[PDB]
Design a protein around this motif. Structure first.
Motif, PDB file in Angstrom:
ATOM      1  N   UNK A1026     -14.747  -0.507  -6.950  1.00  9.35           N
ATOM      2  CA  UNK A1026     -14.471   0.130  -5.677  1.00  9.35           C
ATOM      3  C   UNK A1026     -15.716   0.819  -5.132  1.00  9.35           C
ATOM      4  N   UNK A1027     -15.827   0.948  -3.811  1.00  6.19           N
ATOM      5  CA  UNK A1027     -17.012   1.583  -3.226  1.00  6.19           C
ATOM      6  C   UNK A1027     -17.159   3.032  -3.663  1.00  6.19           C
ATOM      7  N   UNK A1037     -15.167   5.588   3.015  1.00  9.61           N
ATOM      8  CA  UNK A1037     -14.159   6.588   3.333  1.00  9.61           C
ATOM      9  C   UNK A1037     -12.877   6.285   2.574  1.00  9.61           C
ATOM     10  N   UNK A1038     -12.283   7.321   1.994  1.00  6.64           N
ATOM     11  CA  UNK A1038     -11.081   7.141   1.196  1.00  6.64           C
ATOM     12  C   UNK A1038      -9.874   6.914   2.094  1.00  6.64           C
ATOM     13  N   UNK A1039      -9.099   5.885   1.777  1.00  8.18           N
ATOM     14  CA  UNK A1039      -7.835   5.594   2.442  1.00  8.18           C
ATOM     15  C   UNK A1039      -6.739   6.004   1.462  1.00  8.18           C
ATOM     16  N   UNK A1040      -6.351   7.273   1.520  1.00  3.66           N
ATOM     17  CA  UNK A1040      -5.485   7.858   0.521  1.00  3.66           C
ATOM     18  C   UNK A1040      -4.040   7.426   0.659  1.00  3.66           C
ATOM     19  N   UNK A1041      -3.179   8.132  -0.075  1.00  6.81           N
ATOM     20  CA  UNK A1041      -1.762   7.790  -0.098  1.00  6.81           C
ATOM     21  C   UNK A1041      -1.076   8.152   1.214  1.00  6.81           C
ATOM     22  N   UNK A1044      -1.634   5.456   3.619  1.00  9.37           N
ATOM     23  CA  UNK A1044      -0.757   4.343   3.271  1.00  9.37           C
ATOM     24  C   UNK A1044       0.656   4.579   3.786  1.00  9.37           C
ATOM     25  N   UNK A1064     -11.824  -3.089  -0.741  1.00 10.50           N
ATOM     26  CA  UNK A1064     -12.066  -2.262  -1.914  1.00 10.50           C
ATOM     27  C   UNK A1064     -12.275  -3.064  -3.188  1.00 10.50           C
TER      28      UNK A1064
ATOM     29  N   UNK C  21      -5.063   6.863 -13.269  1.00 12.34           N
ATOM     30  CA  UNK C  21      -5.291   5.514 -12.762  1.00 12.34           C
ATOM     31  C   UNK C  21      -4.428   5.227 -11.542  1.00 12.34           C
ATOM     32  N   UNK C  22      -3.118   5.446 -11.659  1.00  9.93           N
ATOM     33  CA  UNK C  22      -2.176   5.092 -10.601  1.00  9.93           C
ATOM     34  C   UNK C  22      -2.501   5.776  -9.280  1.00  9.93           C
ATOM     35  N   UNK C  23      -2.399   7.104  -9.252  1.00  9.05           N
ATOM     36  CA  UNK C  23      -2.495   7.836  -7.994  1.00  9.05           C
ATOM     37  C   UNK C  23      -3.887   7.727  -7.383  1.00  9.05           C
ATOM     38  N   UNK C  24      -4.926   7.765  -8.217  1.00  4.27           N
ATOM     39  CA  UNK C  24      -6.278   7.824  -7.671  1.00  4.27           C
ATOM     40  C   UNK C  24      -6.835   6.445  -7.333  1.00  4.27           C
ATOM     41  N   UNK C  25      -6.430   5.395  -8.050  1.00  4.97           N
ATOM     42  CA  UNK C  25      -7.071   4.096  -7.896  1.00  4.97           C
ATOM     43  C   UNK C  25      -6.133   2.964  -7.504  1.00  4.97           C
ATOM     44  N   UNK C  26      -4.844   3.211  -7.366  1.00  2.00           N
ATOM     45  CA  UNK C  26      -3.934   2.134  -6.995  1.00  2.00           C
ATOM     46  C   UNK C  26      -3.158   2.429  -5.723  1.00  2.00           C
ATOM     47  N   UNK C  27      -2.741   3.673  -5.517  1.00  2.00           N
ATOM     48  CA  UNK C  27      -2.053   4.073  -4.301  1.00  2.00           C
ATOM     49  C   UNK C  27      -3.009   4.512  -3.201  1.00  2.00           C
ATOM     50  N   UNK C  28      -4.304   4.581  -3.489  1.00  2.00           N
ATOM     51  CA  UNK C  28      -5.293   4.952  -2.500  1.00  2.00           C
ATOM     52  C   UNK C  28      -6.690   4.619  -2.973  1.00  2.00           C
ATOM     53  N   UNK C  29      -7.498   4.013  -2.107  1.00  2.00           N
ATOM     54  CA  UNK C  29      -8.799   3.495  -2.497  1.00  2.00           C
ATOM     55  C   UNK C  29      -9.840   3.898  -1.465  1.00  2.00           C
ATOM     56  N   UNK C  30     -11.099   3.618  -1.784  1.00  2.00           N
ATOM     57  CA  UNK C  30     -12.185   3.716  -0.821  1.00  2.00           C
ATOM     58  C   UNK C  30     -12.474   2.335  -0.250  1.00  2.00           C
TER      59      UNK C  30
END
Lengths: 1121, 49, 48
Positions: A1026-1027, A1037-1041, A1044, A1064, C21-30
C-alpha cells in the motif's frame, strides 16, 4: 524606567506596582544550580535559613556513600563531587554537533575492614551535561528544554465515598510513597476496617496491629473510644502474635514456606527500612504535617514508622465517626478532614534538577550492583577503587534521559515568546504522570487553588486540554516542589509593604483581598465592603477588618503569553486561550514593528527571552558593524559581541540580530544593544499594525476569511525568510565505498552546471525542484542488464558503469537560494560516527510573501486564511484617499464574545492619530482619572493597556472624540469610531459609515507552501503493498472506514471497488491501469488486494485452516504467478 | 454451556485433537522482513525473536 | 519484552485493535491519485 534604554510607551494603568516581575527563567536556572550545588545557591540557602544545604549530586552520593558487602569486610565510599571547566562553548557545540558538558570527578575511597588498609583515588564520572545561561541544554548540537512535571506528592490521603447498594458512607486512607509498597485502609459495609498491604486482598487491621507486636489489651486501651474497632477485634478469629504474623506472611507471599524470622524481616524490609521503602523529604514532611507528628524536629528519617501507621488508623476511625479534631499521643492537635488530590497543596512540581537527580540515582544503583558483583570475584590486596567502578551506566542513564524522555523536548524557536513559554511550561504527562487517555474530567479543571500559580487561560485546545499549563508571572517554587505566590500583608485595614510568599495550604487559612481594592495614601481601605476569596475559592464580600492579605498586581493570575493580550477582560475564555496559543505561533518578519497598543509585558518578555543582546558593563561603543559590536568601559575592558546573522532556528524560521546603537553612544549595564528576530528596540513585536475595516465585502471574507490589500505584497510587509537544511553522508558499504563527485553516470550535461569541482553546488546558485545539491554515487555490484538496454548502450557508446546515482536533490515543491555549505571529512580529523566517511550540509533560504491560504490571526483569538488579495484601487478608501489594508467580516465578532479587538481597533486609531484633550473650562468629567501625561500625545505614539487595569470604555469614547485632524485639517473618523468609505471598484460611497481603525495582526506558521501535496504514483510499503503516508514521503491520502460508509450510502460500488483494489493493493492492476491510461484504452477489471492474502497467511500461521471455496466445493489456490 | 461446546465439536467433521499441537507453522519471510535500513542498520519484525 | 522494556508483538497483536490488520488495512487504505490542500472561499464559482 527600570530598563536603562527603553522606548517611551505611555500607560493607562492607575495602580502602583509594589513588586516587580521576577526573573522569568529562574524556574530552570535555580533548579539546575541547586542540582550542581553552585556557590550562589549555597548563599541563597544560607540567607533563607539553613542547617546544612546539599545539592542533588551531594544528596545522592551521601545516600549511596556506604557500599558494604554481605560479609562486611569491604566498603566503598564516594564523596566530593567537583566540576571542571567546560569542554567547549555553546557556538562550537552547535556548529560541530557536540554536547555542552563538563567533566565530573568524585573521590572514591576503599576500606578493607579486616586489615584496616584504605585507598583513595579521584574517579572520573563522565561528561555531565550543563545548562546554559538561557535555560537550555545543547545535546548533540540541538537545543532542548526539560519541562517541569506536575505530580502528586507522596503522603497520606483520606477519601470518602457513598455506596449505591446500601446508601452508607465509606472512608479510606492511602499511603503513597516514592519507591515503596502501597498501604491502604478502608471501611466497608460490614463496618469492618480492612488493610490491603501492597495490592493483596483485604485483612482486618487488628491482624496487622497484632503482628506489629501489639496485644489485645493494647488495642483495647488504644482504640477504646470507637465501636468499629471493637467489632473488628471481636471478629478477628486470630489470637496471639505469631498466628497473625503467619497469616500475614501467607497472604503476602504465597508459595513460600514460612519461618519465625522470615516474616519479621519481610515486614521490616517492606515498611521500616531504607532499602525498599522511602517516604522522601516531601513525603515525610507531608505525613508529619498531616498527622501532627515530629513537630519541630529536622527531616532526617525517610521511612515509615509504627507511630505513623497507628496515627493513620486512629485518624481514619475518628474521621469515619465524625470528629473534627484529633491529638496523637505525644503530638500536636490537627484538624480531621478529607484530602483533595487535585489541590495545589497536594500536587508538587518536579523540575529539571529533580528529574536529572532521579536518573543519576538509577545510574548509581546500577553501578553499585556492578560494584557488588565485582567485589566478590577479584582477589583482595589488589582491589583498587578504579578497578571496581564502571562509570558507563551513569552516563548511559543521563544520555537515555536526555534523548528518550518525554519531558526533554526540542526547544520551540518560532519566536522568543515560544521559547520563553516553553521553558515556563508545567506538564502532567510523562514517566510517573498521567496519560492523555486515562485522565477523566476531574484533573482537566481550573481548581480554585491555581490562582497566582497556574494560568487558567493558556493551555492546549486539542486532546491535551488541562494537562499542560504555564506558570504565572509572580509564581515561585518551594524547595519541596510546591508553587508559592506573593501577597501583601495587611493589618487593621492598613496595607503594609511586607510581601510574604504563601502556598495553597497557607493561603487557605487566611482570607485574601483583591489588588483593585481602593486604598488611601497610607493603606486604609476607603470603602468598608471588600471583595475577598475565602477557603474554598468562595468569592465574597467582607468588612475591612477581616482581611489579612492582598494581591500584588491585578494580573497575578495570568501567564506571560496571556499578559500580552490588551483588553483581556473583554474577551471570553475560549477566545483568550486561542489568542495566546496563536500568539505563540507567529513567525519573524524581515522587518519588525512594535504594536501601537500593548500591555507593557513586551520589554520584560523580550529581555528575559534571551534572543536580544544586552550590554554587560556600562561604557561607550567603539565599532558597530552588522556582525560584531565592540564596547569600551569605564573600567578599561573591551567587550566584543558577535551577532547571529541568518541562522536557522529549530523550526526553519530565520533568526538574525541587528544592532540598534551607533559609534560613540554611551550605553548602560543592562541596556539593549541589538534586537532579535521578533524585537524592535528591545520590545516584543510579533506582527504588524494594519488599517482594518469591519464590513462584509462581496463574500470574499465569508466564513472567517480575510481580504488583504496588494500593498502588503508590494512593500514586503508580511514577508518572512525560511531556511531549510539538507544533509547527506557518504559512508562505507560492504560492496564498496561511496564517493561524492560530479560524475552522475546517466544524466544530461546542463544539470551539472551549478556544481563545483568537488561535486557540490555553488553558494548563491538558485535551486529549483529536483535540482542536484550534492553529487553522490554508490557501488552497484554485478547486475544483469536487459538485452534492449545493452543494445542501446552499444548503439550510443555509453558504457554501463557499476555505480548507482544517489545524489541529494531538492525535495518536491521546494526551492530557494543556497546560502551555506558545511563539509565534514574523516581524513581531516572530524568526529564523525562509525562507518561515515564524509558529510555535507546545504542551507537553502527562501523569502515568502503573503498569499491566499496563509493563516493570519490577532491577539484576541480571531484567525483566518486569506481568501483574496485585491489590488490597491479595489480596496475601500477613506475620503482622504487612504486605502484600507485588511477587511474583517462583521458576522464573526458578536457570536464569539471577543469584542476586545474592536476596542483595540478604536484605540489603535487614536494611537496612530495623536490626541489633545481640551482642558479648557477645566478637566473633562470623563477624563477625571486619566494620568496627566495622557492629556495629549503626538502622532504615531504608542500606548500601554495593562491586562486588568487599563483604558475604560468612557475614556476610549472621550479619546475617540478628542483625536486631532490629518494634514488637511479634517477628521476622517468621528466620535463613534466610524468613517465614510468609498467603493474602490464602483466609486459610489457606501451608504452607511464603517468601523475603521488600526489592528495588530500576526502571520502564523501555517502556510499553504507546507500544506499542498499531490501524488499519482510513488513509493509503496513492504508487507502490504500500500502507498506510504505523509508529504515528506510522497505518500497518498487515506480513504478510511468513514469514507467507505459514505460511498456505500451513496451507492457507488465501482468507485469504492477501484479505490480499494487498483489504487492501493492490486499489484498487477496498478501497472495495468497506468499502461491503459497512457495508451488510451479502457481501465481493466480489478484483481485481488494483497492485504487479503496477507491476512490469510497470518490466519494460517495461527493454526487456522482458512480456505477459499469455489462453487463446486473445491479449494482455490492463492499461489497465482 | 458444555452441551454448546460439545455439540459444536460433534456437528462439524473436525476433531478436538486440533487443540494440541505437534507442529508449529512458520510464516513466510517476506511478512516478517529483515531489511537493511540506510546506513547499514538492520530491522526485525519481532516475530523472528 | 525486548530492549526498552517494550513487549514483543505477536500474531494476535497483528490481528487485533484499531491498529490491527482488519481495521487499519482492510476496511480503509491509502490510495493513489489523491492530494490534500487548504481550502479558501470562491464566491464566483457555480454550485458544480
Amino acid at each position: 524606567n527600570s530598563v536603562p534604554g527603553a522606548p517611551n510607551r505611555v500607560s493607562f494603568a492607575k495602580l502602583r506596582e509594589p513588586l516587580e516581575v521576577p526573573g522569568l527563567l529562574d524556574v530552570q536556572t535555580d533548579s539546575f544550580e541547586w542540582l550542581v550545588g553552585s556557590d550562589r545557591w549555597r548563599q541563597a540557602a544560607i540567607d533563607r535559613g539553613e542547617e546544612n544545604p546539599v545539592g542533588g549530586l551531594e544528596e545522592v552520593l551521601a545516600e549511596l556513600s556506604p557500599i558494604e558487602d554481605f560479609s562486611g569486610s569491604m566498603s566503598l565510599s564516594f564523596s566530593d563531587p567537583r566540576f571542571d571547566e567546560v569542554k567547549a562553548s555553546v557556538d562550537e557545540c552547535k556548529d560541530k554537533d557536540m554536547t555542552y558538558a563538563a567533566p565530573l570527578f568524585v573521590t572514591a575511597e576503599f576500606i578493607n575492614n579486616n586489615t584496616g588498609e584504605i585507598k583513595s583515588q579521584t574517579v572520573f564520572m563522565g561528561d555531565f551535561p550543563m545548562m546554559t545561561e538561557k535555560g537550555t541544554f545543547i545535546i548533540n548540537g540541538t537545543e532542548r528544554v526539560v519541562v517541569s512535571q506536575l505530580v502528586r506528592s507522596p503522603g497520606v490521603y483520606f477519601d470518602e465515598t457513598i455506596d449505591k447498594s446500601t446508601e452508607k458512607t465509606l472512608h479510606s486512607v492511602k499511603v503513597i510513597p516514592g519507591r515503596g509498597a502501597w498501604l491502604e485502609f478502608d471501611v466497608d459495609k460490614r463496618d469492618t476496617v480492612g488493610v490491603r498491604i501492597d495490592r493483596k486482598r483485604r485483612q482486618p487491621v487488628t491482624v496487622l496491629l497484632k503482628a506489629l507486636g501489639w496485644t489485645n489489651e493494647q488495642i483495647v486501651e488504644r482504640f477504646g473510644f470507637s465501636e468499629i474497632m471493637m467489632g473488628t477485634l471481636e471478629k478477628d478469629t486470630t489470637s496471639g502474635t505469631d498466628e497473625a504474623l503467619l497469616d500475614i506472611y501467607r497472604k503476602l507471599r504465597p508459595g513460600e514456606p514460612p519461618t519465625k524470622e522470615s516474616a519479621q524481616t519481610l515486614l521490616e524490609n517492606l515498611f521500616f527500612k531504607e532499602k525498599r521503602y522511602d517516604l522522601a523529604r516531601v513525603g515525610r514532611y507531608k505525613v508529619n504535617k498531616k498527622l501532627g507528628l515530629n513537630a519541630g524536629k529536622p527531616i532526617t528519617s525517610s521511612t515509615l514508622t509504627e507511630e505513623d501507621v497507628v496515627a493513620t488508623i486512629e485518624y481514619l476511625v475518628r474521621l469515619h465517626e465524625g470528629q473534627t479534631s484529633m491529638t496523637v499521643p505525644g503530638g500536636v492537635e490537627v484538624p480531621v478532614e478529607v484530602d483533595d488530590i487535585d489541590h495545589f497543596g497536594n500536587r508538587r512540581l518536579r523540575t529539571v534538577g529533580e528529574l536529572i537527580q532521579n536518573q543519576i540515582r538509577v545510574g548509581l544503583s546500577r553501578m553499585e550492583r556492578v560494584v557488588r558483583e565485582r567485589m566478590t570475584t577479584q582477589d583482595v590486596e589488589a582491589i583498587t577503587p578504579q578497578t571496581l567502578i564502571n562509570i558507563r551506566p551513569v552516563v548511559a542513564a543521563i544520555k537515555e534521559f536526555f534523548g528518550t524522555s518525554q519531558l526533554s523536548q526540542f526547544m520551540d524557536q518560532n519566536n522568543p515568546l515560544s521559547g520563553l513559554t516553553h521553558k515556563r511550561r508545567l506538564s502532567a504527562l510523562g514517566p510517573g504522570g498521567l496519560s492523555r487517555e486515562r485522565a477523566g474530567l476531574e484533573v482537566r479543571d481550573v481548581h480554585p487553588s491555581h490562582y497566582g500559580r497556574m494560568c487558567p487561560i493558556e493551555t492546549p485546545e486539542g486532546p491535551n486540554i488541562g494537562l499542560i499549563g504555564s506558570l504565572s508571572v509572580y509564581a515561585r517554587v518551594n524547595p519541596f516542589g510546591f508553587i508559592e505566590t506573593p501577597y501583601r500583608k495587611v493589618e487593621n485595614g492598613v496595607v503594609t509593604d511586607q510581601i510574604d510568599y504563601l502556598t495553597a495550604d497557607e493561603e487557605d487559612r487566611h482570607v485574601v483581598a483583591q489588588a483593585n481594592s481602593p486604598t488611601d495614601e497610607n493603606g486604609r481601605f476607603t470603602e468598608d465592603r471588600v471583595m475577598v476569596r475565602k477557603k474554598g475559592g468562595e468569592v465574597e464580600f467582607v468588612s475591612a477588618d477581616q482581611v489579612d492579605y492582598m494581591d500584588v498586581s491585578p494580573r497575578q493570575m495570568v501567564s506571560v503569553a496571556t499578559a500580552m493580550i490588551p483588553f483581556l477582560e473583554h474577551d471570553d475564555a475560549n477566545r483568550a486561550l486561542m489568542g495566546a496559543n496563536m500568539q505563540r505561533q507567529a513567525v519573524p518578519l524581515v522587518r519588525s514593528e512594535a504594536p501601537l497598543v500593548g500591555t507593557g509585558m513586551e520589554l520584560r518578555a523580550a529581555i528575559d527571552a534571551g534572543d536580544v543582546v544586552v550590554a554587560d558593563k556600562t561604557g561607550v561603543i567603539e565599532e558597530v558593524s552588522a556582525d560584531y559590536i565592540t564596547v569600551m568601559a569605564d573600567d578599561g575592558t573591551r567587550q566584543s559581541y558577535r551577532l547571529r546573522k541568518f541562522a536557522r532556528s529549530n523550526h526553519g524560521t530565520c533568526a538574525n540580530q541587528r544592532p540598534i546603537v551607533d559609534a560613540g553612544q554611551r550605553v548602560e549595564a543592562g541596556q539593549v544593544i541589538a534586537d532579535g528576530p521578533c524585537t524592535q528596540n528591545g520590545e516584543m513585536a510579533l506582527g504588524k499594525n494594519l488599517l482594518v475595516a469591519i464590513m462584509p465585502w462581496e463574500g470574499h471574507n465569508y466564513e472567517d476569511a480575510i481580504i488583504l490589500s496588494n500593498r502588503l505584497v508590494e512593500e514586503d510587509v508580511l514577508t518572512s525568510i525560511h531556511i531549510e537544511e539538507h544533509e547527506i553522508d557518504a559512508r562505507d558499504t560492504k560492496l564498496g565505498a561511496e564517493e561524492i563527485t560530479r560524475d552522475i553516470p546517466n544524466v544530461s550535461d546542463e544539470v551539472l552546471a551549478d556544481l563545483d569541482e568537488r561535486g557540490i553546488v555553488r553558494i548563491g546558485a538558485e535551486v529549483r525542484d529536483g535540482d542536484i545539491l550534492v553529487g553522490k554515487v554508490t557501488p552497484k555490484g554485478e547486475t544483469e542488464l536487459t538485452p534492449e538496454e545493452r543494445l542501446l548502450r552499444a548503439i550510443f557508446g555509453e558504457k554501463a558503469r557499476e555505480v548507482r546515482d544517489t545524489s541529494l536533490k531538492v525535495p518536491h515543491g521546494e526551492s530557494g537560494k543556497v546560502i551555506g555549505i558545511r563539509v565534514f571529512s574523516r581524513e581531516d580529523d572530524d568526529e564523525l560516527p562509525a562507518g561515515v566517511n564524509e558529510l555535507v550540509r546545504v542551507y537553502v533560504a527562501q523569502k515568502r510573501k503573503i498569499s491566499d491560504g496563509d493563516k493570519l490571526a490577532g491577539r484576541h483569538g480571531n484567525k483566518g486564511v486569506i481568501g483574496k488579495i485585491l489590488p490597491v484601487e479595489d480596496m475601500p478608501f477613506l475620503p482622504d484617499g487612504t486605502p484600507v489594508d485588511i477587511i474583517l467580516n462583521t458576522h464573526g465578532v458578536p457570536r464569539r464574545m471577543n469584542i476586545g479587538q474592536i476596542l483595540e481597533t478604536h484605540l489603535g486609531w487614536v494611537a496612530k492619530a495623536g490626541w489633545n484633550i481640551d482642558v479648557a473650562a477645566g478637566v473633562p468629567d470623563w477624563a477625571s482619572k486619566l494620568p496627566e501625561e495622557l492629556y495629549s500625545a503626538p502622532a504615531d505614539s504608542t500606548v500601554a493597556t495593562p491586562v486588568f487595569d487599563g483604558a475604560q470604555e468612557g475614556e476610549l469614547a472621550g479619546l475617540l472624540g478628542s483625536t486631532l485632524p490629518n494634514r488637511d485639517g479634517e477628521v476622517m473618523v468621528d466620535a463613534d469610531g466610524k468613517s465614510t468609505l468609498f467603493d474602490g471598484r464602483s466609486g459610489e460611497p457606501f451608504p452607511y459609515p464603517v468601523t475603521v481603525g488600526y489592528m495588530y495582526i500576526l502571520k502564523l506558521h501555517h502556510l499553504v507552501d507546507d500544506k499542498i501535496h499531490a501524488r499519482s504514483t510513488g513509493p509503496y510499503s513492504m508487507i502490504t503493498q500500500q502507498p506510504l503516508g505523509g508529504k515528506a514521503q510522497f505518500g497518498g491520502q487515506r480513504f478510511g472506514e468513514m469514507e467507505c460508509w459514505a460511498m456505500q450510502a451513496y451507492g457507488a460500488a465501482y468507485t469504492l471497488q477501484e479505490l480499494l483494489t487498483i489504487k492501493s493493493d492490486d499489484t498487477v492492476g496498478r501497472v495495468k491501469v497506468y499502461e491503459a491510461i497512457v495508451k488510451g484504452e479502457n481501465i481493466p477489471e480489478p484483481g485481488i488486494p494483497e492485504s487479503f492474502k496477507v491476512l490469510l497467511k497470518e490466519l494460517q500461521s495461527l493454526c487456522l485452516n482458512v480456505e477459499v471455496l469455489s462453487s463446486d466445493g473445491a479449494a482455490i489456490e492463492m499461489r497465482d504467478g | 454451556k458444555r452441551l454448546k461446546v460439545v455439540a459444536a465439536f460433534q456437528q462439524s467433521g473436525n476433531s478436538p485433537m486440533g487443540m494440541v499441537l505437534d507442529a508449529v507453522p512458520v510464516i513466510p519471510p517476506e511478512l516478517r522482513p529483515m531489511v537493511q535500513l540506510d546506513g547499514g542498520r538492520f530491522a526485525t519484525s519481532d516475530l523472528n525473536d | 519484552t525486548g530492549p526498552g522494556n517494550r513487549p514483543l508483538k505477536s500474531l494476535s497483536d497483528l490481528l487485533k485493535g484499531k491498529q490491527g490488520r482488519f481495521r487499519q488495512n482492510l476496511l480503509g487504505k491509502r490510495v493513489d491519485y489523491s492530494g490534500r490542500s487548504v481550502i479558501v472561499v470562491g464566491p464566483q464559482l457555480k454550485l458544480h
